[PDB]
Amino acid sequence: DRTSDYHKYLKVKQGDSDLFKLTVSDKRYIWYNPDPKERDSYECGEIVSETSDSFTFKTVDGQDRQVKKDDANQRNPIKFDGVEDMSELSYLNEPAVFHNLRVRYNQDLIYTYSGLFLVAVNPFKRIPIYTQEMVDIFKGRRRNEVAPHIFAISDVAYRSMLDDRQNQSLLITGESGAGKTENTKKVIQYLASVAGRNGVLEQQILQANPILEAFGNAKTTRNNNSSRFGKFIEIQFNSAGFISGASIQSYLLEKSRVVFQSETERNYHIFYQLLAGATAEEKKALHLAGPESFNYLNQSGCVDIKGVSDSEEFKITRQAMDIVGFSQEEQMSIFKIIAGILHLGNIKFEKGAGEGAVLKDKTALNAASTVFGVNPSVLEKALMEPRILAGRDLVAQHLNVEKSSSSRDALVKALYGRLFLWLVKKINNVLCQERKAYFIGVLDISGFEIFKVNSFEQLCINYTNEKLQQFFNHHMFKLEQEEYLKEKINWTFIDFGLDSQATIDLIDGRQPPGILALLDEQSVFPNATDNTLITKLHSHFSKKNAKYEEPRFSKTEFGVTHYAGQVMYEIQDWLEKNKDPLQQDLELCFKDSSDNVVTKLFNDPNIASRAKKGANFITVAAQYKEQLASLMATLETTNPHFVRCIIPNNKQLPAKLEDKVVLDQLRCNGVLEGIRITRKGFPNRIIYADFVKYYLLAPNVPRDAEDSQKATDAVLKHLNIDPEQYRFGITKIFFRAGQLARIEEARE
Numbered sequence: 001d002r003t004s005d006y007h008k009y010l011k012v013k014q015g016d017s018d019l020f021k022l023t024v025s026d027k028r029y030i031w032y033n034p035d036p037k038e039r040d041s042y043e044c045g046e047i048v049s050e051t052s053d054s055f056t057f058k059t060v061d062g063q064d065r066q067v068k069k070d071d072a073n074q075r076n077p078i079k080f081d082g083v084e085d086m087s088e089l090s091y092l093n094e095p096a097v098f099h100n101l102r103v104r105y106n107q108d109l110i111y112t113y114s115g116l117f118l119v120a121v122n123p124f125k126r127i128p129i130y131t132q133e134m135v136d137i138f139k140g141r142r143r144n145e146v147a148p149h150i151f152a153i154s155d156v157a158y159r160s161m162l163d164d165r166q167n168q169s170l171l172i173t174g175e176s177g178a179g180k181t182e183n184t185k186k187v188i189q190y191l192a193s194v195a196g197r198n199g200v201l202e203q204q205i206l207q208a209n210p211i212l213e214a215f216g217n218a219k220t221t222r223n224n225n226s227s228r229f230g231k232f233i234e235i236q237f238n239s240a241g242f243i244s245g246a247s248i249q250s251y252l253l254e255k256s257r258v259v260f261q262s263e264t265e266r267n268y269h270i271f272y273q274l275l276a277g278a279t280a281e282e283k284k285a286l287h288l289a290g291p292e293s294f295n296y297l298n299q300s301g302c303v304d305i306k307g308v309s310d311s312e313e314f315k316i317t318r319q320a321m322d323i324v325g326f327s328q329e330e331q332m333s334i335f336k337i338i339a340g341i342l343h344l345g346n347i348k349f350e351k352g353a354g355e356g357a358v359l360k361d362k363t364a365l366n367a368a369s370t371v372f373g374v375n376p377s378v379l380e381k382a383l384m385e386p387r388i389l390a391g392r393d394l395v396a397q398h399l400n401v402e403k404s405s406s407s408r409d410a411l412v413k414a415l416y417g418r419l420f421l422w423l424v425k426k427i428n429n430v431l432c433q434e435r436k437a438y439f440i441g442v443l444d445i446s447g448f449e450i451f452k453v454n455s456f457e458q459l460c461i462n463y464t465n466e467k468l469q470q471f472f473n474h475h476m477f478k479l480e481q482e483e484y485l486k487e488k489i490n491w492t493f494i495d496f497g498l499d500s501q502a503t504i505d506l507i508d509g510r511q512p513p514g515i516l517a518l519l520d521e522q523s524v525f526p527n528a529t530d531n532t533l534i535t536k537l538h539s540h541f542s543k544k545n546a547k548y549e550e551p552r553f554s555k556t557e558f559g560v561t562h563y564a565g566q567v568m569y570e571i572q573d574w575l576e577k578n579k580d581p582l583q584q585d586l587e588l589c590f591k592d593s594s595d596n597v598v599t600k601l602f603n604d605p606n607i608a609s610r611a612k613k614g615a616n617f618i619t620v621a622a623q624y625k626e627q628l629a630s631l632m633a634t635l636e637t638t639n640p641h642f643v644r645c646i647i648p649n650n651k652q653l654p655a656k657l658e659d660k661v662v663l664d665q666l667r668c669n670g671v672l673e674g675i676r677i678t679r680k681g682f683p684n685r686i687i688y689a690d691f692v693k694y695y696l697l698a699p700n701v702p703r704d705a706e707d708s709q710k711a712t713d714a715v716l717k718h719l720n721i722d723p724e725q726y727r728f729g730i731t732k733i734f735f736r737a738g739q740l741a742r743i744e745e746a747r748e
């Protein structure tokens, strides 16, 4: 009851007895805008009088305003305040849907169903609703039996996997720093505990994220634990139904945050966990120092995160590596690479004689060579005098300072990119015990974000977030109504106005050439510069596509109108970034290294060998588009389950819910639209034959029910369920929102 730990934090407090006096009021209020210049700051006014098609209400100041019934945003009766499934609301609109979230969010209730998907508002405070007792409660309990919780929808997916024998997937969407990553960990926590043993394999799967989070997450201005990479986690399942293995796919590692970090941002956690928290023997063994003494860590102006102990986190990272099985040496080799990368950044090239770079001080070069186990003179020549094939001859390129310091970074980014690729490979090798029968995918991705300087990585992220949103639209709006008409159910199509396939096409469109398609052309073009690229973009579709803007104010930028707003991307040096060039003498300098890992990085074809596209190597953009599209096809194979995560504010503060911010997310996520289709449509659908699965209250249910149509109708007829509430079609019976929930509860 109310004393339960679950009533305290998961269900709405029972209201005052004086509140009852108001909850029964016959009054009718309405949300309005005291300032029409701000269409997201509403206030509650009381409808005083109504004409045939108008309302008159008294503002909070007392002034009488007047509005048409068509444009009016009526307030639901306060009996709905706190309701769990928002499709049960009568007056359904942006103001009301947002108020129900203030109510719940103010009671530390962050989860709220709305239709078949789930909403999750980031609390930014540790809410004790993920303990073991919780997981035990939702084990078996139906979605309708329990309150909104990530465990609930994770169980619905699990039960839908067994009942229907179909693969599932939990698709979690949201803005940057909205709770995507945290909810995934909880989803993994639930599934593992529910379909585990009585375990090792289950313990191992849990310990994967701490590893990846150490090398994969970092501090952005939007989020102090930001996934700079995207991951799709399949939970393989046995024929019986228990977990048999797992597999992790990784995408878009922001591998240049290594060599550079924006002001107030931070490099990947793994580097700071080492310096602060490394053994005194490793410290001098790897020639380590303080964060402020390394050129790749002292530039951001920030080496410390609020309420985070890198020394303690360093413990956790290597605790997890032991559990999955990284050798005592394999771990030391990793730290060996990290130190080596830190030293590389401290190499200070200088114009010795003018013709090219000259490296006077070699203390940093050798400290990096010592760890990597490479001949420091081979590395020095491969960084500054690499060799190339001029025709068929062999020529050494006496690179200058700016061109030598870049090849340095090209190496650094290559190492870590491959290092990261190796970690996941070492993890999948121990988790892919077998190609299993069923599988549940979990999609944690780097989230839509807008920084002061937007670059290629941001485009590919937002392109992903955009592609993901349209997927939400296709299965909630387009495919849902096609099922109705596919069953001849007398449905009139509804255009909810949510479609971003235009912005997608602009980016990845092949014919006509999309943005990425031109970059590929310009990239291979030898004389292609940034001048030629940006001009080849404006001239192409400046005034030919409404999702594109050539700014009057910058010759190096272009705007794209995403589903979450317009992002002005900076084009500087995208050509090299899409080529991802790594000078070849560098690749040899390390292919002959004296370290196991470093050797496996540049000699294992799966990690070093970049695919080839006929004449030229495959580009980044071309590669990722193939990676993403491959993932999207895999998703279409499974029944999805959406979790729309929402960030309450842009300051990472708890109990500070900003109206303007939240509505922009709801407004563009289709949350409001997403309920209408659930409310005005028929969410639940089941084959007519599969419904008999026989309640011994005037029973006339033959298992082998010839003419299933009449067989099920008789049950519904006796059940005395409103026939309007359940229109049925050719092959399956369709139920309106919750109509089936009240039907299946009879058995229980």
Ligand SMILES: Cc1ccc2[nH]c3c(O)cc(Br)c(Br)c3c2c1
Pocket (backbone or CB within 6 Å): 252, 253, 254, 255, 256, 257, 455, 456, 457, 574, 577, 578, 620
């Ligand atoms: C793996 C990859 C591929 C292309 C990229 N383009 C970037 C950019 O323009 C800025 C930053 Br920071 C990064 Br990381 C990338 C990147 C990474």
Ligand SMILES: [Mg+2]
Pocket (backbone or CB within 6 Å): 180, 181, 225, 226, 227, 444, 445, 446
């Ligand atoms: Mg994340």
